Amino acid sequence: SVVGSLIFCLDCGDLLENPNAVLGSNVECSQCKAIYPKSQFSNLKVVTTTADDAFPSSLRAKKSV
Amino acid sequence: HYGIQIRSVRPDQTSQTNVLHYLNDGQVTFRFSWRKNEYLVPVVMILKALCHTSDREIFDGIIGNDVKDSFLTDRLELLLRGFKKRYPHLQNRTQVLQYLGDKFRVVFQASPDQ
Amino acid sequence: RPSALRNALGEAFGTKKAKKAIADLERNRIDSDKLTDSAIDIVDSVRTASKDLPTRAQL
Ligand SMILES: [Zn+2]
């Protein structure tokens, strides 16, 4: 299926053309010629955060009780 | 600065240095020395030159069950989209290998025949 | 084969790529026909400054 903002074909698994950059009702593959999905996919979205390293402060050391 | 250095040896105790640089772009560059000269190869060229495959196998090989870590997920997304956007005309192993044989013909000195 | 070396170059480096690109800006044709006849006139000025070569056969 779709994994985050990454989706591949259910048979060949090749990288596909961006569904938010196509004009038709489907997605054409770069190597084979198959239609997946019917463009009624759950929309392309991710959830990302920071890593608790790039933000230094003495206030952060105050949280080290 | 992030780099995997490795020293690939042969069974005659010779060796060859292979360096992997992380880029700030989304590609991973490869250093290898040859005859007091080096080169720079994008690593997905090497990946699809070893064996014909799909990108899902690359996903299953690198990150595995760590799919919630969206950091490396977006890094691999950069890598795959940049590879198949920069040269989409390469779609098997044979095209890429003959691309390599054209790019690396006049230095390995096997040019009039092979 | 120099163009094949440049084809390996443009993928190969960033320091030898810049070095041989400077060498290609250095390589380019340093003689045209109008420049050829102008330099023929300058070799006539070399005739004017012809500090003559020794005869290298009898001396
Ligand atoms: Zn497909």
JSON list of C-alpha atoms and ligand atoms in Angstrom, two decimals:
[
{"chain": "A", "resi": 1, "resn": "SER", "atom": "CA", "xyz": [0.00, 0.00, 0.00]},
{"chain": "A", "resi": 2, "resn": "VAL", "atom": "CA", "xyz": [0.99, 3.62, 0.51]},
{"chain": "A", "resi": 3, "resn": "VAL", "atom": "CA", "xyz": [3.62, 4.16, 3.22]},
{"chain": "A", "resi": 4, "resn": "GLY", "atom": "CA", "xyz": [3.61, 7.81, 4.24]},
{"chain": "A", "resi": 5, "resn": "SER", "atom": "CA", "xyz": [4.18, 9.83, 1.08]},
{"chain": "A", "resi": 6, "resn": "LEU", "atom": "CA", "xyz": [5.56, 6.71, -0.63]},
{"chain": "A", "resi": 7, "resn": "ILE", "atom": "CA", "xyz": [3.43, 4.38, -2.76]},
{"chain": "A", "resi": 8, "resn": "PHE", "atom": "CA", "xyz": [4.44, 1.75, -5.31]},
{"chain": "A", "resi": 9, "resn": "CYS", "atom": "CA", "xyz": [2.69, -0.71, -7.60]},
{"chain": "A", "resi": 10, "resn": "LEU", "atom": "CA", "xyz": [1.01, -3.74, -6.06]},
{"chain": "A", "resi": 11, "resn": "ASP", "atom": "CA", "xyz": [2.68, -6.02, -8.64]},
{"chain": "A", "resi": 12, "resn": "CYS", "atom": "CA", "xyz": [5.99, -4.56, -9.84]},
{"chain": "A", "resi": 13, "resn": "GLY", "atom": "CA", "xyz": [6.64, -2.06, -7.04]},
{"chain": "A", "resi": 14, "resn": "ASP", "atom": "CA", "xyz": [8.15, 0.51, -9.38]},
{"chain": "A", "resi": 15, "resn": "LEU", "atom": "CA", "xyz": [8.24, 4.22, -8.60]},
{"chain": "A", "resi": 16, "resn": "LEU", "atom": "CA", "xyz": [5.26, 6.04, -10.06]},
{"chain": "A", "resi": 17, "resn": "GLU", "atom": "CA", "xyz": [4.30, 9.48, -11.32]},
{"chain": "A", "resi": 18, "resn": "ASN", "atom": "CA", "xyz": [3.04, 11.89, -8.65]},
{"chain": "A", "resi": 19, "resn": "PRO", "atom": "CA", "xyz": [-0.79, 11.74, -8.36]},
{"chain": "A", "resi": 20, "resn": "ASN", "atom": "CA", "xyz": [-0.70, 15.45, -7.50]},
{"chain": "A", "resi": 21, "resn": "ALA", "atom": "CA", "xyz": [1.10, 16.01, -10.82]},
{"chain": "A", "resi": 22, "resn": "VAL", "atom": "CA", "xyz": [-1.04, 13.86, -13.15]},
{"chain": "A", "resi": 23, "resn": "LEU", "atom": "CA", "xyz": [-4.06, 15.01, -15.14]},
{"chain": "A", "resi": 24, "resn": "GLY", "atom": "CA", "xyz": [-5.92, 11.73, -15.68]},
{"chain": "A", "resi": 25, "resn": "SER", "atom": "CA", "xyz": [-7.98, 9.57, -13.37]},
{"chain": "A", "resi": 26, "resn": "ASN", "atom": "CA", "xyz": [-5.15, 7.11, -12.62]},
{"chain": "A", "resi": 27, "resn": "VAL", "atom": "CA", "xyz": [-1.39, 6.84, -12.18]},
{"chain": "A", "resi": 28, "resn": "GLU", "atom": "CA", "xyz": [0.76, 5.49, -15.01]},
{"chain": "A", "resi": 29, "resn": "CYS", "atom": "CA", "xyz": [3.87, 3.51, -14.11]},
{"chain": "A", "resi": 30, "resn": "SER", "atom": "CA", "xyz": [7.34, 4.36, -15.37]},
{"chain": "A", "resi": 31, "resn": "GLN", "atom": "CA", "xyz": [8.07, 0.80, -16.54]},
{"chain": "A", "resi": 32, "resn": "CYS", "atom": "CA", "xyz": [4.82, -1.12, -16.83]},
{"chain": "A", "resi": 33, "resn": "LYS", "atom": "CA", "xyz": [1.44, 0.31, -17.91]},
{"chain": "A", "resi": 34, "resn": "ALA", "atom": "CA", "xyz": [-1.00, -0.32, -15.07]},
{"chain": "A", "resi": 35, "resn": "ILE", "atom": "CA", "xyz": [-3.60, 1.79, -13.29]},
{"chain": "A", "resi": 36, "resn": "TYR", "atom": "CA", "xyz": [-3.30, 2.02, -9.48]},
{"chain": "A", "resi": 37, "resn": "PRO", "atom": "CA", "xyz": [-5.17, 3.57, -7.75]},
{"chain": "A", "resi": 38, "resn": "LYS", "atom": "CA", "xyz": [-8.39, 5.07, -9.09]},
{"chain": "A", "resi": 39, "resn": "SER", "atom": "CA", "xyz": [-7.09, 8.45, -7.72]},
{"chain": "A", "resi": 40, "resn": "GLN", "atom": "CA", "xyz": [-9.39, 8.11, -4.67]},
{"chain": "A", "resi": 41, "resn": "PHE", "atom": "CA", "xyz": [-6.41, 7.40, -2.44]},
{"chain": "A", "resi": 42, "resn": "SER", "atom": "CA", "xyz": [-5.91, 8.62, 1.10]},
{"chain": "A", "resi": 43, "resn": "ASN", "atom": "CA", "xyz": [-4.05, 11.87, 0.51]},
{"chain": "A", "resi": 44, "resn": "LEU", "atom": "CA", "xyz": [-0.28, 12.29, 0.56]},
{"chain": "A", "resi": 45, "resn": "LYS", "atom": "CA", "xyz": [0.74, 13.37, 4.05]},
{"chain": "A", "resi": 46, "resn": "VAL", "atom": "CA", "xyz": [3.48, 12.89, 6.65]},
{"chain": "A", "resi": 47, "resn": "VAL", "atom": "CA", "xyz": [3.96, 13.68, 10.35]},
{"chain": "A", "resi": 48, "resn": "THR", "atom": "CA", "xyz": [7.50, 14.73, 11.30]},
{"chain": "A", "resi": 49, "resn": "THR", "atom": "CA", "xyz": [9.10, 16.17, 14.45]},
{"chain": "A", "resi": 50, "resn": "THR", "atom": "CA", "xyz": [12.49, 17.33, 15.76]},
{"chain": "A", "resi": 51, "resn": "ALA", "atom": "CA", "xyz": [15.13, 15.11, 17.38]},
{"chain": "A", "resi": 52, "resn": "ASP", "atom": "CA", "xyz": [15.83, 16.80, 20.78]},
{"chain": "A", "resi": 53, "resn": "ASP", "atom": "CA", "xyz": [19.38, 17.63, 19.72]},
{"chain": "A", "resi": 54, "resn": "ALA", "atom": "CA", "xyz": [19.32, 20.74, 17.54]},
{"chain": "A", "resi": 55, "resn": "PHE", "atom": "CA", "xyz": [17.78, 23.01, 20.22]},
{"chain": "A", "resi": 56, "resn": "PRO", "atom": "CA", "xyz": [20.28, 23.84, 22.99]},
{"chain": "A", "resi": 57, "resn": "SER", "atom": "CA", "xyz": [19.36, 25.88, 26.07]},
{"chain": "A", "resi": 58, "resn": "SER", "atom": "CA", "xyz": [20.01, 26.05, 29.79]},
{"chain": "A", "resi": 59, "resn": "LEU", "atom": "CA", "xyz": [16.23, 25.68, 30.09]},
{"chain": "A", "resi": 60, "resn": "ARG", "atom": "CA", "xyz": [16.69, 22.23, 28.55]},
{"chain": "A", "resi": 61, "resn": "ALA", "atom": "CA", "xyz": [19.22, 21.45, 31.28]},
{"chain": "A", "resi": 62, "resn": "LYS", "atom": "CA", "xyz": [16.59, 22.58, 33.78]},
{"chain": "A", "resi": 63, "resn": "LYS", "atom": "CA", "xyz": [14.48, 19.65, 32.53]},
{"chain": "A", "resi": 64, "resn": "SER", "atom": "CA", "xyz": [17.28, 17.24, 33.60]},
{"chain": "A", "resi": 65, "resn": "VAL", "atom": "CA", "xyz": [16.01, 16.83, 37.18]},
{"chain": "B", "resi": 1, "resn": "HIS", "atom": "CA", "xyz": [30.94, 15.05, 7.38]},
{"chain": "B", "resi": 2, "resn": "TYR", "atom": "CA", "xyz": [28.94, 11.82, 7.69]},
{"chain": "B", "resi": 3, "resn": "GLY", "atom": "CA", "xyz": [30.85, 9.06, 5.92]},
{"chain": "B", "resi": 4, "resn": "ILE", "atom": "CA", "xyz": [31.11, 5.29, 5.81]},
{"chain": "B", "resi": 5, "resn": "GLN", "atom": "CA", "xyz": [34.70, 4.38, 5.03]},
{"chain": "B", "resi": 6, "resn": "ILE", "atom": "CA", "xyz": [35.32, 0.75, 4.12]},
{"chain": "B", "resi": 7, "resn": "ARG", "atom": "CA", "xyz": [38.43, -1.07, 2.90]},
{"chain": "B", "resi": 8, "resn": "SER", "atom": "CA", "xyz": [37.31, -3.83, 0.53]},
{"chain": "B", "resi": 9, "resn": "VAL", "atom": "CA", "xyz": [39.92, -6.56, 0.21]},
{"chain": "B", "resi": 10, "resn": "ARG", "atom": "CA", "xyz": [40.51, -9.41, -2.23]},
{"chain": "B", "resi": 11, "resn": "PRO", "atom": "CA", "xyz": [41.69, -12.94, -1.29]},
{"chain": "B", "resi": 12, "resn": "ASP", "atom": "CA", "xyz": [45.27, -12.03, -2.37]},
{"chain": "B", "resi": 13, "resn": "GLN", "atom": "CA", "xyz": [45.42, -9.44, 0.47]},
{"chain": "B", "resi": 14, "resn": "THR", "atom": "CA", "xyz": [45.10, -6.55, -1.96]},
{"chain": "B", "resi": 15, "resn": "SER", "atom": "CA", "xyz": [42.44, -3.95, -1.23]},
{"chain": "B", "resi": 16, "resn": "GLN", "atom": "CA", "xyz": [40.48, -0.94, -2.47]},
{"chain": "B", "resi": 17, "resn": "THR", "atom": "CA", "xyz": [39.11, 2.04, -0.53]},
{"chain": "B", "resi": 18, "resn": "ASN", "atom": "CA", "xyz": [35.39, 2.77, -0.82]},
{"chain": "B", "resi": 19, "resn": "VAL", "atom": "CA", "xyz": [33.95, 5.94, 0.71]},
{"chain": "B", "resi": 20, "resn": "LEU", "atom": "CA", "xyz": [30.27, 6.83, 1.20]},
{"chain": "B", "resi": 21, "resn": "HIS", "atom": "CA", "xyz": [29.44, 10.52, 1.72]},
{"chain": "B", "resi": 22, "resn": "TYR", "atom": "CA", "xyz": [26.06, 11.76, 2.89]},
{"chain": "B", "resi": 23, "resn": "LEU", "atom": "CA", "xyz": [24.95, 14.77, 0.86]},
{"chain": "B", "resi": 24, "resn": "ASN", "atom": "CA", "xyz": [22.84, 17.76, 1.79]},
{"chain": "B", "resi": 25, "resn": "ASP", "atom": "CA", "xyz": [20.84, 17.15, -1.42]},
{"chain": "B", "resi": 26, "resn": "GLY", "atom": "CA", "xyz": [19.34, 13.66, -1.13]},
{"chain": "B", "resi": 27, "resn": "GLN", "atom": "CA", "xyz": [21.87, 11.58, -3.04]},
{"chain": "B", "resi": 28, "resn": "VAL", "atom": "CA", "xyz": [24.73, 9.53, -1.54]},
{"chain": "B", "resi": 29, "resn": "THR", "atom": "CA", "xyz": [28.10, 9.89, -3.24]},
{"chain": "B", "resi": 30, "resn": "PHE", "atom": "CA", "xyz": [30.71, 7.18, -3.67]},
{"chain": "B", "resi": 31, "resn": "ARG", "atom": "CA", "xyz": [34.48, 7.58, -3.82]},
{"chain": "B", "resi": 32, "resn": "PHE", "atom": "CA", "xyz": [36.76, 4.89, -5.20]},
{"chain": "B", "resi": 33, "resn": "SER", "atom": "CA", "xyz": [40.39, 5.23, -6.23]},
{"chain": "B", "resi": 34, "resn": "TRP", "atom": "CA", "xyz": [41.90, 3.96, -9.48]},
{"chain": "B", "resi": 35, "resn": "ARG", "atom": "CA", "xyz": [45.45, 4.53, -10.81]},
{"chain": "B", "resi": 36, "resn": "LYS", "atom": "CA", "xyz": [46.07, 7.76, -8.84]},
{"chain": "B", "resi": 37, "resn": "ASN", "atom": "CA", "xyz": [42.59, 9.01, -9.74]},
{"chain": "B", "resi": 38, "resn": "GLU", "atom": "CA", "xyz": [39.16, 8.82, -8.14]},
{"chain": "B", "resi": 39, "resn": "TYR", "atom": "CA", "xyz": [35.55, 9.09, -9.28]},
{"chain": "B", "resi": 40, "resn": "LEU", "atom": "CA", "xyz": [32.12, 10.02, -7.94]},
{"chain": "B", "resi": 41, "resn": "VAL", "atom": "CA", "xyz": [29.19, 7.68, -8.55]},
{"chain": "B", "resi": 42, "resn": "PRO", "atom": "CA", "xyz": [25.60, 8.06, -7.31]},
{"chain": "B", "resi": 43, "resn": "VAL", "atom": "CA", "xyz": [24.85, 4.97, -5.29]},
{"chain": "B", "resi": 44, "resn": "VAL", "atom": "CA", "xyz": [21.53, 3.97, -6.91]},
{"chain": "B", "resi": 45, "resn": "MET", "atom": "CA", "xyz": [23.42, 3.50, -10.18]},
{"chain": "B", "resi": 46, "resn": "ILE", "atom": "CA", "xyz": [25.47, 0.88, -8.31]},
{"chain": "B", "resi": 47, "resn": "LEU", "atom": "CA", "xyz": [22.31, -0.56, -6.71]},
{"chain": "B", "resi": 48, "resn": "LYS", "atom": "CA", "xyz": [20.47, -1.17, -9.96]},
{"chain": "B", "resi": 49, "resn": "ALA", "atom": "CA", "xyz": [23.75, -2.15, -11.63]},
{"chain": "B", "resi": 50, "resn": "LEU", "atom": "CA", "xyz": [24.25, -5.06, -9.23]},
{"chain": "B", "resi": 51, "resn": "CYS", "atom": "CA", "xyz": [20.83, -6.60, -9.79]},
{"chain": "B", "resi": 52, "resn": "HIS", "atom": "CA", "xyz": [17.52, -5.77, -11.43]},
{"chain": "B", "resi": 53, "resn": "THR", "atom": "CA", "xyz": [15.03, -5.00, -8.70]},
{"chain": "B", "resi": 54, "resn": "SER", "atom": "CA", "xyz": [12.29, -2.65, -7.54]},
{"chain": "B", "resi": 55, "resn": "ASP", "atom": "CA", "xyz": [12.48, 0.29, -5.17]},
{"chain": "B", "resi": 56, "resn": "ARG", "atom": "CA", "xyz": [10.37, -1.58, -2.60]},
{"chain": "B", "resi": 57, "resn": "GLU", "atom": "CA", "xyz": [13.28, -3.98, -2.15]},
{"chain": "B", "resi": 58, "resn": "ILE", "atom": "CA", "xyz": [15.51, -0.99, -1.39]},
{"chain": "B", "resi": 59, "resn": "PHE", "atom": "CA", "xyz": [12.94, 0.20, 1.16]},
{"chain": "B", "resi": 60, "resn": "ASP", "atom": "CA", "xyz": [12.73, -3.26, 2.72]},
{"chain": "B", "resi": 61, "resn": "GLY", "atom": "CA", "xyz": [16.51, -3.51, 2.85]},
{"chain": "B", "resi": 62, "resn": "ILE", "atom": "CA", "xyz": [17.42, -0.14, 4.34]},
{"chain": "B", "resi": 63, "resn": "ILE", "atom": "CA", "xyz": [14.86, 0.89, 6.92]},
{"chain": "B", "resi": 64, "resn": "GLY", "atom": "CA", "xyz": [12.97, -2.37, 7.55]},
{"chain": "B", "resi": 65, "resn": "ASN", "atom": "CA", "xyz": [10.45, -2.24, 10.39]},
{"chain": "B", "resi": 66, "resn": "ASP", "atom": "CA", "xyz": [11.47, 1.35, 11.29]},
{"chain": "B", "resi": 67, "resn": "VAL", "atom": "CA", "xyz": [8.78, 2.88, 9.08]},
{"chain": "B", "resi": 68, "resn": "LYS", "atom": "CA", "xyz": [7.58, 5.46, 11.64]},
{"chain": "B", "resi": 69, "resn": "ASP", "atom": "CA", "xyz": [10.97, 7.21, 11.47]},
{"chain": "B", "resi": 70, "resn": "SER", "atom": "CA", "xyz": [9.93, 9.69, 8.79]},
{"chain": "B", "resi": 71, "resn": "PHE", "atom": "CA", "xyz": [13.41, 11.27, 8.73]},
{"chain": "B", "resi": 72, "resn": "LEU", "atom": "CA", "xyz": [15.11, 8.41, 6.89]},
{"chain": "B", "resi": 73, "resn": "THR", "atom": "CA", "xyz": [11.82, 7.75, 5.06]},
{"chain": "B", "resi": 74, "resn": "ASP", "atom": "CA", "xyz": [11.94, 11.22, 3.52]},
{"chain": "B", "resi": 75, "resn": "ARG", "atom": "CA", "xyz": [15.66, 10.75, 2.83]},
{"chain": "B", "resi": 76, "resn": "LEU", "atom": "CA", "xyz": [14.94, 7.59, 0.84]},
{"chain": "B", "resi": 77, "resn": "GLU", "atom": "CA", "xyz": [12.02, 9.37, -0.82]},
{"chain": "B", "resi": 78, "resn": "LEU", "atom": "CA", "xyz": [14.44, 12.12, -1.91]},
{"chain": "B", "resi": 79, "resn": "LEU", "atom": "CA", "xyz": [16.83, 9.44, -3.17]},
{"chain": "B", "resi": 80, "resn": "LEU", "atom": "CA", "xyz": [14.32, 7.50, -5.26]},
{"chain": "B", "resi": 81, "resn": "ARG", "atom": "CA", "xyz": [12.50, 10.53, -6.72]},
{"chain": "B", "resi": 82, "resn": "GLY", "atom": "CA", "xyz": [15.79, 12.27, -7.53]},
{"chain": "B", "resi": 83, "resn": "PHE", "atom": "CA", "xyz": [17.21, 9.16, -9.19]},
{"chain": "B", "resi": 84, "resn": "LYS", "atom": "CA", "xyz": [14.18, 8.41, -11.34]},
{"chain": "B", "resi": 85, "resn": "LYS", "atom": "CA", "xyz": [13.73, 12.12, -12.10]},
{"chain": "B", "resi": 86, "resn": "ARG", "atom": "CA", "xyz": [17.35, 12.90, -13.01]},
{"chain": "B", "resi": 87, "resn": "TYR", "atom": "CA", "xyz": [17.62, 10.01, -15.51]},
{"chain": "B", "resi": 88, "resn": "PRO", "atom": "CA", "xyz": [14.31, 8.18, -16.09]},
{"chain": "B", "resi": 89, "resn": "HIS", "atom": "CA", "xyz": [15.60, 6.46, -19.25]},
{"chain": "B", "resi": 90, "resn": "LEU", "atom": "CA", "xyz": [17.38, 3.73, -17.23]},
{"chain": "B", "resi": 91, "resn": "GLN", "atom": "CA", "xyz": [14.89, 0.95, -16.44]},
{"chain": "B", "resi": 92, "resn": "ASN", "atom": "CA", "xyz": [16.89, -2.29, -16.13]},
{"chain": "B", "resi": 93, "resn": "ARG", "atom": "CA", "xyz": [20.42, -3.50, -15.36]},
{"chain": "B", "resi": 94, "resn": "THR", "atom": "CA", "xyz": [21.68, -3.83, -18.95]},
{"chain": "B", "resi": 95, "resn": "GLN", "atom": "CA", "xyz": [21.09, -0.18, -19.91]},
{"chain": "B", "resi": 96, "resn": "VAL", "atom": "CA", "xyz": [22.90, 1.03, -16.79]},
{"chain": "B", "resi": 97, "resn": "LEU", "atom": "CA", "xyz": [25.79, -1.41, -17.27]},
{"chain": "B", "resi": 98, "resn": "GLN", "atom": "CA", "xyz": [26.31, -0.35, -20.88]},
{"chain": "B", "resi": 99, "resn": "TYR", "atom": "CA", "xyz": [26.05, 3.24, -19.67]},
{"chain": "B", "resi": 100, "resn": "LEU", "atom": "CA", "xyz": [28.88, 2.42, -17.26]},
{"chain": "B", "resi": 101, "resn": "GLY", "atom": "CA", "xyz": [30.90, 0.71, -19.98]},
{"chain": "B", "resi": 102, "resn": "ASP", "atom": "CA", "xyz": [30.56, 3.79, -22.14]},
{"chain": "B", "resi": 103, "resn": "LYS", "atom": "CA", "xyz": [31.45, 6.14, -19.28]},
{"chain": "B", "resi": 104, "resn": "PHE", "atom": "CA", "xyz": [34.40, 3.99, -18.17]},
{"chain": "B", "resi": 105, "resn": "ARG", "atom": "CA", "xyz": [35.93, 2.80, -21.44]},
{"chain": "B", "resi": 106, "resn": "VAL", "atom": "CA", "xyz": [39.11, 4.81, -22.01]},
{"chain": "B", "resi": 107, "resn": "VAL", "atom": "CA", "xyz": [40.73, 4.45, -18.57]},
{"chain": "B", "resi": 108, "resn": "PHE", "atom": "CA", "xyz": [40.53, 0.72, -17.84]},
{"chain": "B", "resi": 109, "resn": "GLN", "atom": "CA", "xyz": [42.29, 0.13, -21.20]},
{"chain": "B", "resi": 110, "resn": "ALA", "atom": "CA", "xyz": [40.09, -2.49, -22.85]},
{"chain": "B", "resi": 111, "resn": "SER", "atom": "CA", "xyz": [38.61, -0.01, -25.38]},
{"chain": "B", "resi": 112, "resn": "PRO", "atom": "CA", "xyz": [39.30, -1.42, -28.92]},
{"chain": "B", "resi": 113, "resn": "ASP", "atom": "CA", "xyz": [37.53, -4.75, -28.23]},
{"chain": "B", "resi": 114, "resn": "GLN", "atom": "CA", "xyz": [35.13, -5.20, -25.37]},
{"chain": "C", "resi": 1, "resn": "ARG", "atom": "CA", "xyz": [39.56, 9.97, -26.82]},
{"chain": "C", "resi": 2, "resn": "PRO", "atom": "CA", "xyz": [40.21, 13.46, -25.35]},
{"chain": "C", "resi": 3, "resn": "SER", "atom": "CA", "xyz": [36.44, 13.95, -25.59]},
{"chain": "C", "resi": 4, "resn": "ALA", "atom": "CA", "xyz": [35.98, 10.55, -23.93]},
{"chain": "C", "resi": 5, "resn": "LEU", "atom": "CA", "xyz": [38.33, 11.72, -21.18]},
{"chain": "C", "resi": 6, "resn": "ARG", "atom": "CA", "xyz": [36.19, 14.85, -20.82]},
{"chain": "C", "resi": 7, "resn": "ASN", "atom": "CA", "xyz": [33.06, 12.66, -20.68]},
{"chain": "C", "resi": 8, "resn": "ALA", "atom": "CA", "xyz": [34.62, 10.74, -17.80]},
{"chain": "C", "resi": 9, "resn": "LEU", "atom": "CA", "xyz": [35.74, 14.09, -16.35]},
{"chain": "C", "resi": 10, "resn": "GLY", "atom": "CA", "xyz": [32.35, 15.86, -16.23]},
{"chain": "C", "resi": 11, "resn": "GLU", "atom": "CA", "xyz": [31.03, 13.03, -14.05]},
{"chain": "C", "resi": 12, "resn": "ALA", "atom": "CA", "xyz": [34.35, 12.38, -12.29]},
{"chain": "C", "resi": 13, "resn": "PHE", "atom": "CA", "xyz": [35.49, 15.39, -10.28]},
{"chain": "C", "resi": 14, "resn": "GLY", "atom": "CA", "xyz": [35.05, 18.98, -9.21]},
{"chain": "C", "resi": 15, "resn": "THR", "atom": "CA", "xyz": [38.70, 19.95, -8.96]},
{"chain": "C", "resi": 16, "resn": "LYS", "atom": "CA", "xyz": [39.98, 18.20, -12.09]},
{"chain": "C", "resi": 17, "resn": "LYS", "atom": "CA", "xyz": [36.73, 19.19, -13.80]},
{"chain": "C", "resi": 18, "resn": "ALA", "atom": "CA", "xyz": [37.46, 22.85, -13.07]},
{"chain": "C", "resi": 19, "resn": "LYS", "atom": "CA", "xyz": [41.17, 22.39, -13.85]},
{"chain": "C", "resi": 20, "resn": "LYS", "atom": "CA", "xyz": [40.62, 20.89, -17.30]},
{"chain": "C", "resi": 21, "resn": "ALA", "atom": "CA", "xyz": [37.77, 23.32, -18.04]},
{"chain": "C", "resi": 22, "resn": "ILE", "atom": "CA", "xyz": [40.28, 26.13, -17.39]},
{"chain": "C", "resi": 23, "resn": "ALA", "atom": "CA", "xyz": [42.67, 24.18, -19.63]},
{"chain": "C", "resi": 24, "resn": "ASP", "atom": "CA", "xyz": [39.96, 24.10, -22.33]},
{"chain": "C", "resi": 25, "resn": "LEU", "atom": "CA", "xyz": [39.57, 27.86, -22.03]},
{"chain": "C", "resi": 26, "resn": "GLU", "atom": "CA", "xyz": [43.36, 27.73, -22.36]},
{"chain": "C", "resi": 27, "resn": "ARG", "atom": "CA", "xyz": [43.26, 25.17, -25.22]},
{"chain": "C", "resi": 28, "resn": "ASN", "atom": "CA", "xyz": [41.26, 27.15, -27.79]},
{"chain": "C", "resi": 29, "resn": "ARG", "atom": "CA", "xyz": [42.63, 28.17, -31.20]},
{"chain": "C", "resi": 30, "resn": "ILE", "atom": "CA", "xyz": [45.39, 30.75, -30.89]},
{"chain": "C", "resi": 31, "resn": "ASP", "atom": "CA", "xyz": [45.62, 31.46, -34.64]},
{"chain": "C", "resi": 32, "resn": "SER", "atom": "CA", "xyz": [43.32, 32.79, -37.35]},
{"chain": "C", "resi": 33, "resn": "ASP", "atom": "CA", "xyz": [44.22, 33.82, -40.90]},
{"chain": "C", "resi": 34, "resn": "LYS", "atom": "CA", "xyz": [44.01, 37.58, -40.32]},
{"chain": "C", "resi": 35, "resn": "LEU", "atom": "CA", "xyz": [45.96, 36.96, -37.12]},
{"chain": "C", "resi": 36, "resn": "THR", "atom": "CA", "xyz": [48.31, 34.79, -39.20]},
{"chain": "C", "resi": 37, "resn": "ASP", "atom": "CA", "xyz": [49.17, 37.61, -41.59]},
{"chain": "C", "resi": 38, "resn": "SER", "atom": "CA", "xyz": [49.37, 40.09, -38.70]},
{"chain": "C", "resi": 39, "resn": "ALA", "atom": "CA", "xyz": [51.85, 37.75, -37.04]},
{"chain": "C", "resi": 40, "resn": "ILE", "atom": "CA", "xyz": [53.71, 37.51, -40.37]},
{"chain": "C", "resi": 41, "resn": "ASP", "atom": "CA", "xyz": [54.07, 41.29, -40.09]},
{"chain": "C", "resi": 42, "resn": "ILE", "atom": "CA", "xyz": [55.24, 40.84, -36.50]},
{"chain": "C", "resi": 43, "resn": "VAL", "atom": "CA", "xyz": [57.83, 38.30, -37.70]},
{"chain": "C", "resi": 44, "resn": "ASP", "atom": "CA", "xyz": [58.93, 41.02, -40.13]},
{"chain": "C", "resi": 45, "resn": "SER", "atom": "CA", "xyz": [59.44, 43.11, -37.00]},
{"chain": "C", "resi": 46, "resn": "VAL", "atom": "CA", "xyz": [61.43, 40.08, -35.77]},
{"chain": "C", "resi": 47, "resn": "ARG", "atom": "CA", "xyz": [63.50, 40.54, -38.96]},
{"chain": "C", "resi": 48, "resn": "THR", "atom": "CA", "xyz": [64.02, 44.10, -37.68]},
{"chain": "C", "resi": 49, "resn": "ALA", "atom": "CA", "xyz": [65.29, 42.64, -34.38]},
{"chain": "C", "resi": 50, "resn": "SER", "atom": "CA", "xyz": [67.00, 39.67, -36.09]},
{"chain": "C", "resi": 51, "resn": "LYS", "atom": "CA", "xyz": [69.83, 38.94, -33.71]},
{"chain": "C", "resi": 52, "resn": "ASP", "atom": "CA", "xyz": [71.14, 36.36, -36.12]},
{"chain": "C", "resi": 53, "resn": "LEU", "atom": "CA", "xyz": [71.62, 32.68, -35.32]},
{"chain": "C", "resi": 54, "resn": "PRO", "atom": "CA", "xyz": [75.15, 31.23, -35.61]},
{"chain": "C", "resi": 55, "resn": "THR", "atom": "CA", "xyz": [75.87, 29.33, -38.79]},
{"chain": "C", "resi": 56, "resn": "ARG", "atom": "CA", "xyz": [76.30, 26.00, -36.83]},
{"chain": "C", "resi": 57, "resn": "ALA", "atom": "CA", "xyz": [78.04, 24.30, -39.81]},
{"chain": "C", "resi": 58, "resn": "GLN", "atom": "CA", "xyz": [81.45, 25.96, -40.26]},
{"chain": "C", "resi": 59, "resn": "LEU", "atom": "CA", "xyz": [81.99, 28.02, -37.12]},
{"chain": "D", "resi": 1, "resn": "ZN", "atom": "ZN", "xyz": [3.73, -0.93, -12.08]}
]
